Design a protein around this nucleic acid. Sequence first.
DNA 1: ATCAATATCCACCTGCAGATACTACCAAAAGTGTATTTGGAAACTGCTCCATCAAAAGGCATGTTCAGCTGGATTCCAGCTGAACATGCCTTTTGATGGAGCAGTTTCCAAATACACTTTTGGTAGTATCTGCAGGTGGATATTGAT
DNA 2: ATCAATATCCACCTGCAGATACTACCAAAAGTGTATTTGGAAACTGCTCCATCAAAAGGCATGTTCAGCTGGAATCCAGCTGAACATGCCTTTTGATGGAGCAGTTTCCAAATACACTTTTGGTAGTATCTGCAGGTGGATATTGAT
Lengths: 99, 99, 106, 105, 79, 87, 99, 100
Amino acid sequence: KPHRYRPGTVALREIRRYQKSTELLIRKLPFQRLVREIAQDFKTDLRFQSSAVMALQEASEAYLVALFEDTNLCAIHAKRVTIMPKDIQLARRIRGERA
Amino acid sequence: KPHRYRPGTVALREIRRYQKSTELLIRKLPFQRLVREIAQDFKTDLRFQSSAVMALQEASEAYLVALFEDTNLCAIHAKRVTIMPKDIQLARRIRGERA
Amino acid sequence: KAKTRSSRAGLQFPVGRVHRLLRKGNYAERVGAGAPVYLAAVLEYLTAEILELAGNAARDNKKTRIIPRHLQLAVRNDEELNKLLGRVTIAQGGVLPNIQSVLLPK
Amino acid sequence: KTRSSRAGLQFPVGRVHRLLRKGNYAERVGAGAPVYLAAVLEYLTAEILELAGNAARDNKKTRIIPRHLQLAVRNDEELNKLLGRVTIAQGGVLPNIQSVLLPKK
Amino acid sequence: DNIQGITKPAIRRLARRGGVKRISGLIYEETRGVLKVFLENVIRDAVTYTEHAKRKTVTAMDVVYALKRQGRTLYGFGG
Amino acid sequence: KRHRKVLRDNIQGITKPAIRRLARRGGVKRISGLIYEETRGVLKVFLENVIRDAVTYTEHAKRKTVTAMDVVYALKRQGRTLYGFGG
Amino acid sequence: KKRRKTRKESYAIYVYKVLKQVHPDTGISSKAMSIMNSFVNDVFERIAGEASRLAHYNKRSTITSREIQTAVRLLLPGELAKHAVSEGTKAVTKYTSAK
Amino acid sequence: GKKRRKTRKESYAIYVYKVLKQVHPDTGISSKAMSIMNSFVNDVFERIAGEASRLAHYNKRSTITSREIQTAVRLLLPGELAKHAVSEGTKAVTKYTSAK
DNA sequence: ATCAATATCCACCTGCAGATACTACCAAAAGTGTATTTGGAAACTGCTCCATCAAAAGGCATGTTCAGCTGGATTCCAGCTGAACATGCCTTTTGATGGAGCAGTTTCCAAATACACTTTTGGTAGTATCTGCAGGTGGATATTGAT
DNA sequence: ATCAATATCCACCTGCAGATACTACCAAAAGTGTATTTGGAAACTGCTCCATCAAAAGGCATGTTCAGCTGGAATCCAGCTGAACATGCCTTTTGATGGAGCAGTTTCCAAATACACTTTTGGTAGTATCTGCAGGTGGATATTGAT
Ligand SMILES: [Cl-]
Ligand SMILES: [Cl-]
Ligand SMILES: [Cl-]
Ligand SMILES: [Cl-]
Ligand code: NI
Ligand code: NI
Ligand code: NI
Ligand code: NI
Ligand code: NI
Ligand code: NI
Ligand code: NI
Ligand code: NI
Ligand code: NI
Ligand code: NI
Ligand code: NI
Ligand code: NI
Ligand code: NI
Ligand code: NI
Ligand code: NI
Ligand code: NI
Ligand code: NI
Ligand code: NI
Ligand code: NI
Ligand code: NI
Ligand code: NI
Ligand code: NI
Ligand code: NI
Ligand code: NI
Ligand code: NI
Ligand code: NI
Ligand code: NI
Ligand code: NI
Ligand code: NI
Ligand code: NI
Ligand code: NI
Ligand code: NI
Ligand code: NI
Ligand code: NI
Ligand code: NI
Ligand code: NI
Ligand code: NI
Ligand code: NI
Ligand code: NI
Ligand code: NI
Ligand code: NI
Ligand code: NI
Ligand code: NI
Ligand code: NI
Ligand code: NI
Ligand code: NI
Ligand code: NI
């Protein structure tokens, strides 16, 4: 008398959903806090044009999305279907970010 | 009683040897003909300063060695020690040489 | 002024502007009359190509107004623009639908 | 009285003032800019020669060769990165074998 | 927290947009580390453009130019 | 008198031993049999791209000789800067 | 009202005109138009930048139409290069042969 | 002696050699390594000059001053190299500006 | 296979954010015409260096085969670890309102560019001359693989 | 564990390719001084759009349960390494030759700069008209997972 989908079915559904759209996927305020927090170590009492944070979010999420694409290829190459820190790690090394 | 090193022992010795040295590892003339052939298909009646060919070789060897490091890393991620075309392909995909 | 250099060259893009922009850009001491015409035309062509495929992209998705989504689809679907824009991020463009075949059910 | 000696520099301030003009980087070039640049350039040359000199020494050689620049650059985290997209002809690579490839057990 | 404001469901959404099906639990901390390194690099440079301009506000241009030189050109903010 | 021969199949001049040496420098211990043909392919594409830009610079200079500088400028514009050969 | 008028120029109106010639029935959002503006600035910068290098490699002090041409060759991929060279020569011709 | 007078091909090699004597008085340098060195100097010059170029543009300025060069160095060199380069550069400007 | 529960799809709908359309005021952008200057194409030509053949070894390193070791590919399988799931509360968002500071303006001078002798220097040219080290050899220490 | 059969080391040799040091002369580069011009600091200004917190909205932390993916273990065999053997028409290397074409120098004209004076126009700033589609719905039907 419960309705459960098999594991992976909701996953697949979500992929189809999120690849079809373009809305940002991190929530605006936590991102803003983090940006300000990180900037504070370079210079104190800083303000940000609202479009300057927008830019950073767009650039950040584009970057992570593409890193998950590469990460996924790395899992699959190891005959897995679960991404793991070693996958992200190998992507970044080959990309020349860790190297 | 004839003596045989086990498989992998001469290979390891070779890594040490070639990692130690800096000499070009493809022979000069074969490399030069290849350059002249590829260039000729773009444009006929070209000539090359000798240091143009030497620059192309130095550039091509450094590129191939580095691709092997990245490829080696891709085999090891797959829990192998044998490099395979799919390892090179994964390297080139993540480097953006492909996709 | 009789006719704008754009109309002399048959171009909808601002030849004058391009010429001025080449000077103020410190690209070289002198700038020949031909160059801004050549350059303007190249820029028009590339714009037309992108707008052409993004128009198509807008049509398919049953729409008449181009949004960043449509420039993303146009560019990423085209082997050539995609390379040219290999290191570019179009804001609000998302990604091409793609699911690795080994992840598909059963 | 040279501007180099005047700034306390071995690197040529006159030459750097000149190359900055010929390079079309801006309509005007202030007199301090070449001074600063010649200094930065000399600082970096000093850093790499320092370390290359040691690699030569570690290898019982007294003459620096491109192999020495390469050990120097690749062993130094910051030079390595500054020169991360750069190939040093005849530099070879750093000795490095991945653990798993070693024999044991 | 702050870095933890980038929540597990957010990270999961991004991964899905990148075509990811299943996700190891350790991925979340790794993703945040990765994000922090990305922003540090971009912000450091943008803030250097701000300091030069003698401003106390980071402008979109400062970010857009920082992204350019990091080799991550972004379109849509150059007005 | 005028020589010129036909140049063909020179990519096979990149011998198995020479590819084995390069992979060694790259720290590679074991090599599958299909690696040789793959490597030749990848090299060929690398050269095609470098040589093509190099020859473009050659033509633009109105030269018939490809200089070290043409190669050096070509490598530079593809993000593979080479030190050791000039400018 | 010539005070707050620090004129910010953009390729918008020209982008808009070209839109009509290719899809007269179709329009374009703010964000999209902004994307396009960035695109044109960018290609300008890249092409102009490459011409600048060419001119310098050959100790020239002028950027002629020959420089833009080589620049486009070096920059654009195959087919796009072909057509842009086409459009470019066509427009210089037309312009020479205009009163 | 003298063949139609070849045009001057200028390089940083004498400067590089001086700096080498300063840090390692008994060490020499092959001409290949010197070639690498001269390349590296031209390379860093172009890179700094170019960041500077852009910097000026971005701020509607038409002059590259020591301040543009400084921001450029900070944009270009990593961590500890930037700090010391900025310190050596500032040192030099100060030293220079206080003569006369 | 039977089949209920949900997801997904489709036409249709409204309202409003954001598109377009039309007018007016204006600095600066753009061309037009006309004396002035100069980069670079053209013709000639000296001198570098590229192609090419020769003939040896300085014979090295390659291609071919063949044995048999072991890494990679497969199959199976236990438990560990991610996915699915449900909703109150607690964090984000979407609104409102001063005021910080970016961006505009205009004043003015410290420092830039221009231009003229006058001096100094790095490149080069060319013999003249040491020296570090590549490659040789031997003969003493290090490792691998068979028992 | 011994050890035998190699590879590996490294310190002391050589002959010369390549590095450093003569002095030569000089075009160009660099300095010094002088008059003429100017970008941008710096000081003030306003209105834009940024940080703050109103309450209105709604995403997510929590934990428990369990399917299925992961790594571990076991077996098998073929695809790879090592090495022997035969011999490049193979590559290196040395060096000589003829002359292609690159690079340096001159003459000279066409296209660019400099500039003044005229005419246009793209951007900004409203003001008003209007419309494409995001989001809400109703109803068919396709997908999923439990039988
Ligand atoms: Cl992991
Ligand atoms: Cl494979
Ligand atoms: Cl022209
Ligand atoms: Cl200055
Ligand atoms: Ni902090
Ligand atoms: Ni051919
Ligand atoms: Ni296409
Ligand atoms: Ni360091
Ligand atoms: Ni063949
Ligand atoms: Ni159409
Ligand atoms: Ni140059
Ligand atoms: Ni076509
Ligand atoms: Ni700009
Ligand atoms: Ni320090
Ligand atoms: Ni039913
Ligand atoms: Ni049911
Ligand atoms: Ni339907
Ligand atoms: Ni509105
Ligand atoms: Ni002239
Ligand atoms: Ni000239
Ligand atoms: Ni022969
Ligand atoms: Ni067998
Ligand atoms: Ni085994
Ligand atoms: Ni089980
Ligand atoms: Ni768990
Ligand atoms: Ni609720
Ligand atoms: Ni207010
Ligand atoms: Ni204020
Ligand atoms: Ni201000
Ligand atoms: Ni001298
Ligand atoms: Ni000499
Ligand atoms: Ni030796
Ligand atoms: Ni021996
Ligand atoms: Ni043993
Ligand atoms: Ni000699
Ligand atoms: Ni001003
Ligand atoms: Ni002024
Ligand atoms: Ni089970
Ligand atoms: Ni498994
Ligand atoms: Ni089996
Ligand atoms: Ni001769
Ligand atoms: Ni001759
Ligand atoms: Ni000739
Ligand atoms: Ni010539
Ligand atoms: Ni108008
Ligand atoms: Ni308006
Ligand atoms: Ni409507
Ligand atoms: Ni309507
Ligand atoms: Ni809808
Ligand atoms: Ni419904
Ligand atoms: Ni079913």
